[PDB]
Enzyme design. Structure first.
Site, PDB file in Angstrom:
ATOM      1  CG  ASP A   1      63.358  29.607 -28.319  1.00 45.59           C
ATOM      2  OD1 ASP A   1      64.335  29.039 -27.825  1.00 45.59           O
ATOM      3  OD2 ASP A   1      62.654  30.376 -27.660  1.00 45.59           O
TER       4      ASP A   1
ATOM      5  CG  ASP B   1      70.234  32.596 -23.739  1.00 47.53           C
ATOM      6  OD1 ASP B   1      69.513  32.857 -24.715  1.00 47.53           O
ATOM      7  OD2 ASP B   1      70.344  31.443 -23.317  1.00 47.53           O
TER       8      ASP B   1
ATOM      9  CB  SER C   1      69.944  30.292 -27.069  1.00 48.33           C
ATOM     10  OG  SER C   1      68.911  30.805 -26.249  1.00 48.33           O
TER      11      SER C   1
ATOM     12  CG  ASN D   1      67.228  27.485 -26.214  1.00 47.33           C
ATOM     13  OD1 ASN D   1      68.309  27.209 -25.723  1.00 47.33           O
ATOM     14  ND2 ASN D   1      66.881  28.718 -26.519  1.00 47.33           N
TER      15      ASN D   1
ATOM     16  CD  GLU E   1      56.409  27.621 -27.029  1.00 47.13           C
ATOM     17  OE1 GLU E   1      57.146  28.475 -27.557  1.00 47.13           O
ATOM     18  OE2 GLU E   1      56.427  27.422 -25.798  1.00 47.13           O
TER      19      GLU E   1
ATOM     20  CG  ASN F   1      65.503  32.833 -26.429  1.00 48.61           C
ATOM     21  OD1 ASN F   1      64.355  33.259 -26.465  1.00 48.61           O
ATOM     22  ND2 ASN F   1      65.812  31.596 -26.762  1.00 48.61           N
TER      23      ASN F   1
END
Length: 129
Positions: free
Chosen positions: A52, A48, A50, A59, A35, A46
Site C-alpha cells: 500500500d 499477499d 502487495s 494497493n 491510513e 501486505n
C-alpha cells in the site's frame, strides 16, 4: 511530506475532493489520518505480497504498478512511487477512481473502521477553507 491537518484539507478541497461522490471533506481527512498519519511517504506491505502506498494507502495489486506484484492491474496507470510525492495530485486522481468503484469509501479499511459514522466534521474544524 507530512501534512498538517488543515493544510491537507485545503489541498484536498482545491483538488475537488470535498463532497466528491457525496463524501464530505472531513471523511477524506479522517481517512488520510488513519491510513498514513498524513505522511505521503508511507508504505505498508501486505501478507499477499502487495504493498500500500501513500497518504491514502493504495494497493499495488489493483491501483498502481510497483514492478513486484505479479498480476497487478494498475488501474490508475501510474507507478506506485508517484503516490509518495509531496504533490498529492496523483493520489487524489487515483482516489477519485477508487471511490467511484462501487464500494465508495469502504475501500479504505481505516475509513470504514475509524471514520465511518463518526463526527468527521471535527477533522476540518478550525481550518480556513
Amino acid at each position: 511530506k507530512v501534512f498538517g491537518r488543515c493544510e491537507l484539507a485545503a489541498a484536498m478541497k482545491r483538488h475537488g475532493l470535498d463532497n466528491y461522490r457525496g463524501y464530505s471533506l472531513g471523511n477524506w481527512v479522517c481517512a488520510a489520518k488513519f491510513e498514513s498519519n498524513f505522511n505521503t511517504q508511507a508504505t505498508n506491505r501486505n501478507t499477499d505480497g502487495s504493498t500500500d502506498y501513500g497518504i491514502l494507502q493504495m494497493n499495488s495489486r489493483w491501483w498502481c504498478n510497483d514492478g513486484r506484484t505479479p498480476g497487478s492491474r494498475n488501474l490508475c496507470n501510474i507507478p506506485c512511487s508517484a503516490l509518495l510525492s509531496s504533490d498529492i495530485t496523483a493520489s487524489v486522481n487515483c482516489a477519485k477512481k477508487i471511490v467511484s468503484d462501487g464500494n465508495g469509501m469502504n475501500a479504505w479499511v481505516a475509513w470504514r473502521n475509524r471514520c465511518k459514522g463518526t463526527d468527521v466534521q471535527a477533522w476540518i474544524r478550525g481550518c480556513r477553507l
